[PDB]
Structure formats: C-alpha cells, structure tokens
Amino acid sequence: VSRRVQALLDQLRAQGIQDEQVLNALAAVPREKFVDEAFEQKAWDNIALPIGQGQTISQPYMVARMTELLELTPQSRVLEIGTGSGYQTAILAHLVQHVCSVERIKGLQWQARRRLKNLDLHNVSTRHGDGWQGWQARAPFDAIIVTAAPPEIPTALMTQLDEGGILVLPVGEEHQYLKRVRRRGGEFIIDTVEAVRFVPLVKGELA
Ligand SMILES: Nc1ncnc2c1ncn2[C@@H]1O[C@H](CSCC[C@H](N)C(=O)O)[C@@H](O)[C@H]1O
Secondary structure, eight states, X not given: OOHHHHHHHHHHHHTTOOOHHXXXXXXXXXXXXXXXXXXXXXXXXXXXXXOTTSOEEOOHHHHHHHHHHTTOOTTOEEEEEOOTTSHHHHHHHHHSSEEEEEESOHHHHHHHHHHHHHTTOOSEEEEESOGGGOOGGGOOEEEEEESSBOSSOOHHHHHTEEEEEEEEEEEXXXXXXXXXXXXXXXXXXXXXXXXXXXXXXXXXXXX
C-alpha cells in the first residue's frame, strides 16, 4: 500500500476509526479514479473534493465514520442515497453482499455506474432517481446511508428499514447533525452523533 494511502489510514485511525474492515475497504478503493485528473495529487488528502455537478466527493473520515455506524456485515443488504462519484458506493461494495444506490443527477449516476463496472464490482445496483423515496422494490434494508442532508428524516427511509435496520444520515439546514436511526420492533430510535455540513438532499425533480 502506497505512502499516501497509509498516511490517510493512519490519520483516520488517529481520528478514532476502529473498524479495520472499513479501513481495508478504504485502502482497496482507488480514490483517485473518482476525482478529475486535475485533483490527482490531492486524491488521498482527508478532504472533500469537487466532482461533477456542483457536488462533492465526501471527506474520507466522514465516509469511514458513516460506514462504521452502519455496522455492516457480508450479509447486509444496503441502500445508499446519493451515488455521486460512486466512491462511497465502491467502499460499501467491498463490505456487503449487495448495494443499491440512488442518484438524482443522471450525469453522475451514469459515470458512477461505469466506474463501478470498471472496478470489477458486480454487487451494485444503481438508479437515477429521488432518494427521498428510497427504493421500495428492493426493501427492506439492513442498512441505509444518505450522503446529502435533508431538513427532516425522510419517512420512506425509515419504512424501508428491516428489523434491526440502521439508517445513517445528516439532518438539518442551518444546524446539521449526523444521525443514526435504528428500527426496533414497533419503534425507531434516533441518536445524534456529531456536527456535519452536507449539500442538501434535493426533493423531486431529477437532474
Ligand atoms: N433526492 C436525492 N436523491 C438522490 N441523490 C441526491 C438527492 N439530492 C442530492 N443528491 C445527491 O447526493 C450527492 C451528494 S455528494 C455524495 C458523494 C458520494 N457519496 C460519493 O462518494 O461521491 C450528490 O451527488 C447529489 O446529486
């Protein structure tokens, strides 16, 4: 593993990431493939970077943290909202049996699908759509992860959780916090994790 890669991993560990499976997945996904050639030198810096349409690839720490919170196993059926570059999608694909991923901007969904195909990842289903609606046909899910921030928790994304299912998302506008929602019998339990700042999860009209 390259110097820049081990530098990132060490930084993430120092920042409290403990799941070595998640770190191993991070190491195995060529992050540079997910940003423009112009950002090649900084592709492994622990920062967000511009991707195709006013959107950004998330900071590797935030990716690791959110991925940890989902408590994934190789049996997990996962729903991801906000494919973007496909970077987080690729990470999840290394960890679980199947990932379904929804992106509202057709241009991004299309490029992401190709990238994942190019990485020999065959356990991913991608969709151009509005993730406020989840993906009912593929439901329920053991884990749902949202990489854009709605002002409220989308109802469908609780409904589509299986028993013991975990939803992880940033919530808010002026004040955003990362939240974990767990389905437990007749109840959902909502915990607050940390402060964050994401682009909004945009409702309806597909870009
Ligand atoms: N309603 C919606 N449904 C699906 N995706 C949405 C959405 N609103 C915003 N998004 C998308 O959420 C993404 C936030 S950037 C996500 C980064 C991505 N996880 C990666 O690794 O590259 C953007 O691509 C944006 O288009």
